[PDB]
Design a protein around this ligand. Sequence first.
Ligand SMILES: *[C@H](CS(=O)(=O)c1ccccc1)[C@H](CCc1ccccc1)NC(=O)[C@H](Cc1ccccc1)NC(=O)N1CCN(C)CC1
Length: 215
Amino acid sequence: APAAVDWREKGAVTPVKDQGQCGSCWAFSTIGNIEGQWQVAGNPLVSLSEQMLVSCDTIDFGCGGGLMDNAFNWIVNSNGGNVFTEASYPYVSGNGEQPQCQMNGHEIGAAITDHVDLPQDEDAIAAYLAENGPLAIAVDATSFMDYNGGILTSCTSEQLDHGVLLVGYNDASNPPYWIIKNSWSNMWGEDGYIRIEKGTNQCLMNQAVSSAVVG
Ligand SMILES: *[C@H](CS(=O)(=O)c1ccccc1)[C@H](CCc1ccccc1)NC(=O)[C@H](Cc1ccccc1)NC(=O)N1CCN(C)CC1
């Protein structure tokens, strides 16, 4: 793996979004990953629909929670691999209301064929990220609640409860760090991002890493 990668500098990351008062973190994680994989395959960056997942994925529980694994499963096996654009199916669940699935004649922004689980190994994860693009990960978000910036080095690491997007890392920092896009608006953290120390499995970040496969 290279010393540093930041997919924001390669055009593969959309602006920071806000889930609002809905526990839809798992949907943001999933969609952020597909946004990045679709761009890295050689297509234009396009904002895709979390609402499609919140309202239509029947394996997961909308604002009550979900898993990236299940969302990828639903997309491929229940929705023919298709992901609608945000413009066609915009996010309305920020107030916690969950409307019924609409699905009819939406604009398709991206298509995926499969998804993969990555090894529970920070170096393997770094290598795959460097070659392939931003990855869906789960963390213990206990220490995120009080974060304002800097590199978090004493992250509570006990129970996975949040899905975020891994967008880069820097091994030429003391300490080395991962760069993570959160879904709590650009007013949280470092313009919506958090840096956590790399190499000490901070927040249990290595435990549940996955990605869609395009093509
Ligand atoms: C998002 C995390 S959040 O942004 O921190 C958040 C939002 C709102 C309230 C608290 C925290 C959601 C939160 C789910 C939630 C809803 C209502 C009250 C409390 C919590 N977290 C999840 O959906 C997690 C994500 C996840 C992904 C991968 C691995 C582990 C966790 N999913 C989750 O906790 N599940 C999965 C589905 N399930 C049946 C119960 C457990």
